[PDB]
Amino acid sequence: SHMLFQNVSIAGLAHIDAPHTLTSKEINERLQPTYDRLGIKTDVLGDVAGIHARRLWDQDVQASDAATQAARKALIDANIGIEKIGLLINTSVSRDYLQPSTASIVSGNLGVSDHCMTFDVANACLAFINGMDIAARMLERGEIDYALVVDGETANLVYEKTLERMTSPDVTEEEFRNELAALTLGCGAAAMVMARSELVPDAPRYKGGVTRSATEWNKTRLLLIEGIKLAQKTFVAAKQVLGWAVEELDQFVIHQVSRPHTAAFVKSFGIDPAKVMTIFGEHGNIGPASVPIVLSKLKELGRLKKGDRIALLGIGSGLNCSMAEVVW
Amino acid sequence: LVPRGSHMLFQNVSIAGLAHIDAPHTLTSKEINERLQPTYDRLGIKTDVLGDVAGIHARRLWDQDVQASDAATQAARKALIDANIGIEKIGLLINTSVSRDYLQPSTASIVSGNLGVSDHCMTFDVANACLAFINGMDIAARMLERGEIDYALVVDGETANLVYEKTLERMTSPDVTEEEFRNELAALTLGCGAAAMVMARSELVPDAPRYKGGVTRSATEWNKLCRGNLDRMVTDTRLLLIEGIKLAQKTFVAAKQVLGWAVEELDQFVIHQVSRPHTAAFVKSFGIDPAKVMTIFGEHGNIGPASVPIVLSKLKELGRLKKGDRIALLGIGSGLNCSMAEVVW
Question: Which positions does the site annotation Important for activity cover (chain B)?
Answer without folding.
Answer: 272
